[PDB]
Write a protein that holds these residues in place. Structure first.
Motif: not given
Ligand code: 9JT
Ligand code: MYR
Ligand code: MYR
Ligand code: MYR
Ligand code: MYR
Ligand code: MYR
Ligand code: MYR
Ligand code: MYR
Ligand code: MYR
Ligand code: MYR
Ligand code: MYR
Length: 582
Positions: A206, A201-202, A241, A245, A198, A237-238
């Motif tokens: 992406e 990614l941030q 993500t 969250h 995570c 990837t979706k």
């Protein structure tokens, strides 16, 4: 569905339903007693049963988020215990759930969970299996409120299996303690993997995650066509993500959707998924994630024709750069499951740099004609590192290999605290012992995974209290060059040697009756402090001193008068070593 709670109950079943409800409420109400959570779980299960018997029964048509939030908001001690979390109850859905999610506490301040003795653990398990396992599930869930709940349940099942097998054994402890250590290491690593993915990614976008996923999925499903791999990349990837969250229900729904698409398109993806796709929805995505790579197709041609020799290389690249680079990564990764993912990403970055340089050059075709030559040293560097380190491991054994690493890494970064150096070097030795017993075709992926967990542990510790700029640089790097950064560290030439401290090298008789693990930690701590004091000491001098130390320990631990033996022989050993080193 008309009643989501009833459908979830019917698909999951009573046991899994209750376990997951307990996990969720413990991940939100982290301070409440186990009995209160059990009461809440019983109430929720009772309502779910009313919904299963009759989908039109009262409140059964409400959403899972609404039901969960209402049940959360009926807790009487919400204000007194949690404060501003109680203020979420004055919001409408989905604001209420977003507020509840924002008010989770990653690092709750509860005492560390202490492992009881083997016999008391087995006795408690035997007296009441359900309460023992549920209470420990509650204790773990209240401490890791972001951890993916079904994975927590999957860990719990194996914990039950370990207790069932080992509590009826002749030597309970020697059966159960390795299994508990294995499971604890595995769970801590999985949580670290979640947080790490995570954060990467941030921080890095992406696109980098999609490149990583292209590489990993092409390794996993080499017979899949590139369009299918790209579809899987977009969907994964979706999924990641939304799971980053942190909403459990939305994340679980995304994972289930991906799992059932994969199961319905097995013919185009993999030939190893039938068993996972016959499994319940709860286990399906985890099963799919854990299955080994498929066999690559036979007689795959080289990437030369499409990516070096073609006259339309630059046209195809400039037409859609990321699709062309994903195709290159796909073809490269499917042929090389023996590679780490990050090595393939290094190859893709190299090819991209060469294309950006050469397709603007006077003669692009001549310019990038030798791009595959750039891949040779990048590929061979980790292979040679594995060769060297595994040779040293087979020569030394795990403990003496840990000592070699201890000396090496203390010389490289002496500013780091001794506990961190000792813990990380021990874990690196464990990485050696784990991965050096694989055949080469699998050695680099093993190293990538376990090194990633160990290096992440180190980075987290060092960020809690920063002491070295080079460690910080390596720890903030892209994860693709994190490990290469760490391997590129050199001996600290500017270090001012630590001055002698008599207590550090003062030893007592307790060392004889410490556990082997703790005794090893003490010996390794003393070795780190010695290397900090005498960083120029040669391997021969250090080995002579270590042989003297082992002789001294063996003599005084068998001496009739241990205390004075340790004192006198320790003064003698300290002076003799000090005269030998210099
Ligand atoms: Se929440 C909490 C936190 C600390 C100590 C006690 C509680 C608690 O009793 N919560 C609770 C009360 C009544 C019904 C359910 C839960
Ligand atoms: C091996 C973990 C060390 C720290 C915890 C000590 C007690 C471990 C008991 C685990 C029982 C099952 C827990 C679970 O259901 O997830
Ligand atoms: C981030 C790890 C902190 C240490 C957690 C101590 C309790 C670990 C219990 C071992 C099994 C479960 C591991 C897990 O829940 O991730
Ligand atoms: C006119 C386009 C020529 C491109 C070169 C590839 C021709 C064969 C296409 C099928 C094999 C590769 C497909 C893929 O990228 O997965
Ligand atoms: C208030 C009722 C809450 C109970 C609902 C919990 C649902 C959890 C579903 C987890 C399914 C995971 C599927 C997957 O990861 O592939
Ligand atoms: C555990 C991460 C994946 C979450 C979604 C599960 C669906 C698996 C699709 C294939 C992706 C494999 C990822 C992996 O290497 O573990
Ligand atoms: C089909 C999706 C393609 C995604 C982009 C692939 C580009 C490969 C070159 C970049 C590789 C480095 C990735 C990173 O920054 O970590
Ligand atoms: C020059 C800094 C590059 C950073 C990436 C390091 C990649 C690790 C593989 C090492 C192979 C030699 C080439 C190189 O150092 O990049
Ligand atoms: C001390 C660890 C002993 C195992 C040998 C590791 C040698 C370097 C690791 C090479 C693979 C790491 C993954 C990568 O960077 O591509
Ligand atoms: C405690 C600080 C140590 C940090 C450096 C450890 C190096 C880890 C990189 C992978 C280990 C094998 C590769 C190598 O020895 O160069
Ligand atoms: C196989 C077991 C060998 C254990 C070796 C441990 C090495 C510890 C080094 C302690 C050095 C003491 C000398 C000194 O204090 O100056």
């Amino acid at each position: 569905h008309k009643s989501e709670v009833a459908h979830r109950f019917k698909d999951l079943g009573e046991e899994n339903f209750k376990a997951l409800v307990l996990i969720a409420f413990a991940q939100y109400l982290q301070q409440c007693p186990f009995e209160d959570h059990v009461k809440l779980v019983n109430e929720v299960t009772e309502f779910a049963k009313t919904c299963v018997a009759d989908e039109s029964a009262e409140n059964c048509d409400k959403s899972l988020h609404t039901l969960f939030g209402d049940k959360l908001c009926t807790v009487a001690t919400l204000r007194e215990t949690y404060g501003e979390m109680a203020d979420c109850c004055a919001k409408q859905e989905p604001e209420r759930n977003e507020c509840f999610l924002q008010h989770k506490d990653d690092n709750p301040n509860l005492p560390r969970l202490v492992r009881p003795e083997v016999d008391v653990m087995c006795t408690a398990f035997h007296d009441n299996e359900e309460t023992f396992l549920k209470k420990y599930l509650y204790e773990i869930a209240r401490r890791h409120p972001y951890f993916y709940a079904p994975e927590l349940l999957f860990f719990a099942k194996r914990y039950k299996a370990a207790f069932t097998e080992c509590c009826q054994a002749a030597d309970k402890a020697a059966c159960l303690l390795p299994k508990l250590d294995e499971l604890r290491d595995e769970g801590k690593a999985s949580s670290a993997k979640q947080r790490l993915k995570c954060a990467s990614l941030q921080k890095f976008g992406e696109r980098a995650f999609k490149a990583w996923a292209v590489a990993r999925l092409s390794q996993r499903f080499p017979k899949a066509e590139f369009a299918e791999v790209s579809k899987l990349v977009t969907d994964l990837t979706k999924v990641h993500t939304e799971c980053c969250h942190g909403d459990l229900l939305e994340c679980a729904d995304d994972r289930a959707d991906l799992a059932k698409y994969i199961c319905e398109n097995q013919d185009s993806i993999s030939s190893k998924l039938k068993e996972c796709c016959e499994k319940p929805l709860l286990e399906k995505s985890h099963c799919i994630a854990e299955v080994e790579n498929d066999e690559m197709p036979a007689d795959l041609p080289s990437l030369a024709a499409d990516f070096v020799e073609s006259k339309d290389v630059c046209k195809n690249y400039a037409e859609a750069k990321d699709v062309f680079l994903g195709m290159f990564l796909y073809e490269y990764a499917r042929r090389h499951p023996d590679y780490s993912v990050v090595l393939l990403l290094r190859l893709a970055k190299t090819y991209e740099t060469t294309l950006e340089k050469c397709c603007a050059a006077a003669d692009p075709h001549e310019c990038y004609a030798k791009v595959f030559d750039e891949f040779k040293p990048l590929v061979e560097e980790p292979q040679n590192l594995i060769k060297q380190n595994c040779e040293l491991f087979e020569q030394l054994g795990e403990y003496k290999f840990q000592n070699a690493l201890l000396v090496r890494y203390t010389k490289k970064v002496p500013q780091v605290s001794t506990p961190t150096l000792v813990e990380v070097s021990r874990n690196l030795g464990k990485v050696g012992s784990k991965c050096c017993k694989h055949p080469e075709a699998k050695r680099m992926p093993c190293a990538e995974d376990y090194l990633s967990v160990v290096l992440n542990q180190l980075c987290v510790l060092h960020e809690k209290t920063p002491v070295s700029d080079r460690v910080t640089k390596c720890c903030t790097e892209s994860l693709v060059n994190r490990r290469p950064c760490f391997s590129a560290l050199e001996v600290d030439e500017t270090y001012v040697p630590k001055e002698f401290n008599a207590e550090t090298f003062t030893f007592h008789a307790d060392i004889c009756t410490l556990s082997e693990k703790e005794r090893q930690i003490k010996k390794q701590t003393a070795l780190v402090e010695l290397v900090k004091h005498k960083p120029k000491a040669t391997k021969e001098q250090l080995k002579a001193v270590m042989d003297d130390f082992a002789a001294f320990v063996e003599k005084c631990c068998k001496a009739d008068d241990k205390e004075t033996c340790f004192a006198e022989e320790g003064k003698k050993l300290v002076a003799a070593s000090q005269a030998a080193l210099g």
